Amino acid sequence: TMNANLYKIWLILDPRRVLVSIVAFQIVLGLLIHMIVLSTDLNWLDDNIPVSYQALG
Amino acid sequence: ANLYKIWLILDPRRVLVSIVAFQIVLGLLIHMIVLSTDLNWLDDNIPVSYQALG
Amino acid sequence: NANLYKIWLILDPRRVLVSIVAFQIVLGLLIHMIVLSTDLNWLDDNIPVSYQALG
Amino acid sequence: NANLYKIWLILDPRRVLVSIVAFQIVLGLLIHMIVLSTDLNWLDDNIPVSYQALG
Amino acid sequence: TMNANLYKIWLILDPRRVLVSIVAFQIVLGLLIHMIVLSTDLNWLDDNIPVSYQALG
Amino acid sequence: TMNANLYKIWLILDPRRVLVSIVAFQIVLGLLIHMIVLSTDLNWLDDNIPVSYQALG
Amino acid sequence: ANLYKIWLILDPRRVLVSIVAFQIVLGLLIHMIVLSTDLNWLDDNIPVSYQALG
Amino acid sequence: AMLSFEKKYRVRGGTLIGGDLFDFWVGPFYVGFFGVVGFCFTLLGVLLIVWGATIGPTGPTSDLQTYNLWRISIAPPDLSYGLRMAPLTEGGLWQIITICAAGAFISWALREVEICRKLGIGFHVPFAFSFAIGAYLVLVFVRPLLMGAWGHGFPYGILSHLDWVSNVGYQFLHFHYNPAHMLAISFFFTNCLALSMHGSLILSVTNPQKGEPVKTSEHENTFFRDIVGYSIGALAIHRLGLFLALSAAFWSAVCILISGPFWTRGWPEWWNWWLELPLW
Amino acid sequence: ITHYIDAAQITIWAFWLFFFGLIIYLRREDKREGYPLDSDRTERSGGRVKVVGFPDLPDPKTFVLPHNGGTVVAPRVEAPVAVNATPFSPAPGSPLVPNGDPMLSGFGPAASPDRPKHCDLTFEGLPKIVPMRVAKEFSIAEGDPDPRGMTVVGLDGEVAGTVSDVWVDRSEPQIRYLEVEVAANKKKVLLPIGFSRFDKKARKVKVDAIKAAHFANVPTLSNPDQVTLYEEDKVCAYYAGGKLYATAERAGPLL
Amino acid sequence: PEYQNIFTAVQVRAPAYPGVPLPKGNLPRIGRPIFSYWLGKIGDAQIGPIYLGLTGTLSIFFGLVAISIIGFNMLASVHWDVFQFLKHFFWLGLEPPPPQYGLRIPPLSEGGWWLMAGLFLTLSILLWWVRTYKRAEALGMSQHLSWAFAAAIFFYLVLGFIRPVMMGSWAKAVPFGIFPHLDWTAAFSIRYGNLYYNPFHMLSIAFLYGSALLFAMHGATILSVSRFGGDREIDQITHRGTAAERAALFWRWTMGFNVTMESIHRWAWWCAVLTVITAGIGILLSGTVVDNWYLWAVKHGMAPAYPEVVTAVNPYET
Amino acid sequence: LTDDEAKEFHAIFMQSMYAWFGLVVIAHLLAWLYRPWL
Amino acid sequence: SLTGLTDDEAKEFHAIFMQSMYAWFGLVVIAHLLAWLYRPWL
Amino acid sequence: SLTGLTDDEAKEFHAIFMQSMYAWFGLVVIAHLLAWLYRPWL
Amino acid sequence: KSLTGLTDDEAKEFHAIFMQSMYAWFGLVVIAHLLAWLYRPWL
Ligand code: BCL
Ligand code: BCL
Ligand code: BCL
Ligand SMILES: CC[C@H]1c2cc3[nH]c4c(c3C)C(=O)[C@H](C(=O)OC)c4c3nc(cc4[nH]c(cc(n2)[C@@H]1C)c(C(C)=O)c4C)[C@@H](C)[C@@H]3CCC(=O)OC/C=C(\C)CCC[C@H](C)CCC[C@H](C)CCCC(C)C
Ligand SMILES: CCCCCCCCCCCCCCCC(=O)OC[C@H](COP(=O)(O)OCCN)OC(=O)CCCCCCCCCCCCCCC
Ligand SMILES: COC(C)(C)C/C=C/C(C)=C/C=C/C(C)=C/C=C/C(C)=C/C=C\C=C(C)\C=C\C=C(C)\C=C\C=C(C)\C=C\CC(C)(C)OC
Ligand SMILES: CCCCCCCCCCCCO[C@@H]1O[C@H](CO)[C@@H](O[C@H]2O[C@H](CO)[C@@H](O)[C@H](O)[C@H]2O)[C@H](O)[C@H]1O
Missing domain, CATH: 1.20.85.10 (Photosystem II protein D1-like)
Incomplete structure (x- = not known):
């Protein structure tokens, strides 16, 4: 149900600064989420799956 | 009823930019707070514990 | 009082609105945080169940 | 006094109103926090019940 | 034992600054004295009079 | 499934300036990812593979 | 095929100097990293321990 | 919005990196390449601090996790990790936040350089800010490297880092006798005296006694000659204040840099070279 | 008897109340220049909305100038002044680009306000900053070279002219400007000491701010024996424009 | 490159400034001002003149007594041995009275000198405060x-x-x-x-x-x-x-x-x-x-x- | 702002505030039923 | 006169201010009555 | 006006604003429905 | 005379390219999460 005149937001919000803002925020957010998940039981680097490589050595 | 006239008083752009910034911060804050509690869904070993697989 | 509307000839309606919004949000965050620091805490009260116990 | 109204010829009503409001808000937060730091605390008194108990 | 020309003090000292200063001084003094009295045997908030409300729950 | 006027992005962002930003972001990201991987069981420097070179002496 | 045009949009000399500064820093970093691991070649007492020799 | 005299200074260019790509303001803030880069480092670091508070030292369910502002602490790794990256939950989080902090600080300083270039002013402020950054880097990079472990860094906690300072200091029995520390403190105290003198003097001549006109350069000089027989001068007091503040930071960095890397015994005993001179 | 409230806790809370009151005081003082703000919100509101933030502006203070120089008030209503530049982009927050020759635009680091058209004065009421020709009681400190007669070079090492005099501060003795007789047009122009490096053994003054040929357009003094505040700012700002404008490389970026 | 305005490269000289004239009741200033070239590299080359009325004279007298009592006691604590005074200078001190004396004036041999130095240093400082106050008043400054x-x-x-x-x-x-x-x-x-x-x-x-x-x-x-x-x-x-x-x-x-x-x-x-x-x-x-x-x-x-x-x-x- | 403009703002301001207070009461009535605190 | 209000404007602001302040004090008294009934503190 | 917008311009922005806000709140209730079904917290 | 400098036609043109690009980005995000859920479901 998007408004037909939703495009007019770019008459209020500048394209270049919004684009920069989104890229910066998304880069931070992806780095944050990876580090949050890595510090939990969902950690996929330290789970010795499929094998522990410090164990085989 | 004449509530649309709020945009004759408060600047629509600054209200918009304020809402976006506020909601993102609030969203980050609430996820953190819940993650500090029993409700934490990342480190609860549900549906299983993946470190117990290794 | 009847002439109470004339307060918006004294205090700027635009500034007052923005002050109310900012105060209320800060007050709401403060009150939730205070309540969570007490016995009334509804997040870590293991109600209706303890979810960490399920693991 | 019958001419006490003339206090508004020397003190700015806009400044006095905002100052009173600012003072009252600070005082209210201050008093609540003082009472919370005494026997009168109504949040952590486990009355009517202790909610952390159920768990 | 009141002087008749004491009203002429307001020809010497600014009446507005005096009144402002009086209100500020009284508010600070009132806060101060409450805290001093609270910090003595006269403490009326944390004295379990008429009852201790923490001992109830 | 892209857009045929995606090239118009260079009418909004200065292309030589975007090049420098990408390169320095990618170097920094590469530095981070090697460090994170080194912090885990996947560490290839301290795994004694093929041999432990400290135990050779 | 048109890669030489990079020097039509980026200053050749400052690209060079960036490369030199970056490479030297990176070299010190990597030597530091290797030295802090099992691959350390200075204190591995190979071919021999010169201190225990005295 | 802009200051009422600001628009005539908002010029294009003067960037070090980025050019037109990031050459714009956001409200009052100038952005530029180092604004974008610094913003990412800053937002990441802060959010990792909040994440570290969320899970605490031993997990979010333990009694040690806390959002109490004084008690939150994100700590460096055990000394046993040496110069390697620890696991995130064993000090690695502290290490990533450290790299974010250094990048945020250095990007802040380079943004300041771009602003100086726009305004055509001297570079004293980013030069001076570099001394604070240098002291931070002595604390988390130079001194840990010389002793062999990133775990010699201080923890990121409002009160927990005061525990670090106390225990590092008393490793040397009586840290007050550190000679570079005595010199640095002398600079900190002298700087505070000089600042109160300078602030006072400017305010007392621009806000003179009632009925008086604004005072003069001759009054400023006369006033301290009258008290101490000397006036350093209105330009030179700013030279002096900058010299004292930067000297305080510089001798700070020196005093912690020698504590461990270049001296391991008690600090009073250092002064035995003096006591042992063959003069007395 | 035991109580949670204690005097240390009471006193620290009392400090916070004082401190936040102090900050609001200070932020008001901070708004005695430059406010209300120039915004695009005041433009579209037809001037109805004044942007001042929080706290609001203080009531004006008065500065009474000596020697019957008049009264300065702060804050004060200041007239808008046209900007000799065009926006690089129409988006808000974009920079502007100087019109014409940048050195001469009065824009960017070439810009400055219009200070008053009278001189700063000594306590006794004489023009404060004057050439040594006028203040004959001044001399060069023994041990230091006399700048008079030295050759002035621009950023590219080319000869801009010769130092014809030295302008000193009679209130606090120090050089504030060198007077340069410009080779190209034989005009005598001020050169701020802040933009001057001495090469003592060569008897050369080096000026990094501008090229030798840029000295021809240094703003000129109405009276050769004194300088007004207004002219001081116009002179210093002209050199500073060179820091960004005098060569192409100075625009940046490096990479 | 640019001039950083840290050091004055070329100093100028003028006859010493005697100072802003003071109102009646202030004493004439004292000292013949001199110039230091090396101070003139970082700041003002003029040293002097100075103001000295009753407040400052009393301040300086109290303060010299206090300082001399300290130094005297330091030297006495190494038995007058000037060489050992230089050796141990940073360690030497004038010690507060023993706890047994409370707030009573203690004996000269065991704390009286500390109490006198503290009294006289304190009066010296309080009078210096009055001096800073008077010197602003005479110039019409706040x-x-x-x-x-x-x-x-x-x-x-x-x-x-x-x-x-x-x-x-x-x-x-x-x-x-x-x-x-x-x-x-x-x-x-x-x-x-x-x-x-x-x-x-x-x-x-x-x-x-x-x-x-x-x-x-x-x-x-x-x-x-x-x-x-x-x-x-x-x-x-x-x-x-x-x-x-x-x-x-x-x-x-x-x-x-x-x-x-x-x-x-x-x-x-x-x-x-x-x-x-x-x-x-x-x-x-x-x-x-x-x-x-x-x-x-x-x-x-x-x-x-x-x-x-x-x-x-x-x-x-x- | 004119006199009639103050009347118009005040009428809309009061209805908006009481509505806000209405939500507060409902939120607090729900909170009392779930977790009475006095 | 010193503020800019007329002698009538000061009479009008005083009337509304006093009725407003007495109303606020009424809310305070009601709240302290309710507090005394729930938790007498003297 | 104080924002400069005409009366019809405020009506236009309000229709898009209110529509967009309601959509966002609809997403919020749906998320809180899924979360209540997956992990009730009261 | 818009605040950003864009005409109405330019806003429409930018909006259509912005929406397609954001949808494509969200599409990759959904694929990423479907794969993550198949490998390591977390609820
Ligand atoms: C058990 C606890 C629950 C959980 C319960 C909740 C609840 C309840 C809510 C969220 C909401 C969010 N959650 Mg969560 N959440 C969980 C786990 C995750 C994790 C994770 C790694 O585990 C991630 C990264 C997220 C991410 C998110 C965001 C997508 C969203 C907050 C957006 C915001 O702040 O808008 C701020 C930005 C704006 C306001 C900009 C304006 C809107 C623009 C146009 C849209 C931005 C993106 C939009 C939200 C798209 C997401 C819709 C999806 C269908 C969710 N959740 C789990 C499994 N989550 C919120 C949400 O989805 O709101 C609809 C929300 O109400
Ligand atoms: C045992 C301890 C008691 C308690 C006994 C008291 C007593 C006694 C009083 C309060 C008062 C207040 N308490 Mg309490 N209070 C308790 C618990 C709470 C808790 C909580 C989470 O537990 C909350 C958030 C509150 C909140 C409040 C506010 C509603 C009010 C202070 C407002 C102010 O300072 O005005 C400053 C703002 C202004 C002056 C602006 C102008 C006023 C405007 C026009 C009115 C705004 C709406 C107003 C706040 C509506 C509330 C009035 C009702 C009669 C409650 N109390 C408990 C259970 N509380 C005070 C009060 O109600 O004042 C009448 C008061 O006298
Ligand atoms: C068990 C946990 C899972 C895992 C589950 C997920 C899930 C789920 C997701 C990712 C996503 C990502 N994962 Mg992961 N991830 C895992 C392990 C890895 C590892 C690793 C070392 O283990 C690496 C390095 C990554 C890396 C990545 C990235 C490719 C991506 C985040 C991109 C981003 O934030 O852009 C930031 C965003 C932007 C910059 C905006 C979009 C960019 C667009 C395309 C155009 C911008 C161009 C612009 C002009 C220039 C940009 C450059 C600037 C100069 C900086 N993952 C494992 C195995 N991962 C996400 C993804 O794929 O997104 C689709 C995602 O949804
Ligand atoms: C060298 C002499 C002194 C000095 C000078 C100095 N500092 C300066 C400057 C100068 C000239 C600036 O120009 C710059 C500035 O802009 O000031 C307004 C700055 C500054 N000095 C600041 C702080 C500061 N300076 C201090 C000290 C000193 N600065 C010296 C004694 C200290 C002390 C003594 O502790 C602090 C706290 C800031 C106000 C500002 C730099 C602002 C900045 O860099 O912003 C970018 C970063 C953020 C917005 C936050 C980053 C968050 C991180 C990514 C995560 C946090 C990690 C951190 C390591 C955790 C620490 C936790 C615990 C220790 C509590
Ligand atoms: C622990 C308890 C708290 C401790 C705090 C101690 C503070 C006092 C110690 C320092 C002494 C300073 C003396 C000099 C003062 C001075 O000089 O002020 C005067 C000068 C002005 O002079 P001028 O230059 O304009 O003109 C000179 C021509 N005569 O500056 C100031 O107006 C500063 C403004 C004062 C600060 C305002 C603080 C208000 C706090 C309000 C809190 C409200 C909370 C309400 C809660 C219910
Ligand atoms: C031999 O030496 C000669 C004569 C050549 C001169 C040399 C002197 C030298 C070398 C002196 C060296 C001095 C040094 C190195 C001093 C170092 C001093 C330091 C570091 C002092 C630091 C702090 C001291 C403090 C804060 C002391 C404060 C004491 C106070 C405030 C006491 C006040 C006492 C009062 C008001 C007493 C009142 C007495 C009453 C009224 C109570 O009597 C009943
Ligand atoms: C100018 C005069 C100023 C007067 C200043 C007075 C300010 C007083 C503010 C007090 C701060 C609030 O203090 C409130 O009270 C109780 C104390 O019973 C705190 O309660 C907590 O205190 C301590 C510290 O963790 C615990 O040991 C205690 O068991 C716990 O209940 C609440 O966490 C807090 O919400």
């Missing part, structure tokens, strides 16, 4: 310097007089000596359960660090605009120039807000003054109200908790 000086005097008085009197003993005051007053500083924190956990200690540190932050910022800001005459702050305050505009915009663009040329000096004034106000309050509360700052911080919920990796059996328990 009293900002004497107010800030009073804040420092407050802290000094708390250290050596107010707190010792409140605590009933001159033995609780500060010794006069280099390393001895450092011993006292460390011992005070030990005795009162770790001064890091005193909240007014924390504030005083914030303001001491803040003072160096602000003078680095302001000192550097003014030198970066000295090319526009920004060091002449009086006329930048009455007649805003491009120095003051560029200074404010540098900071607004950096950190989002800015002050004025006048009001930065108010920020600086309060930051420096609050350093010693909070310091006085912090010491004033130690021993009188709070006996152990760490336990005060535990009680109010501030002290961090750590995983237990070392611990010790209490032999007083066993």
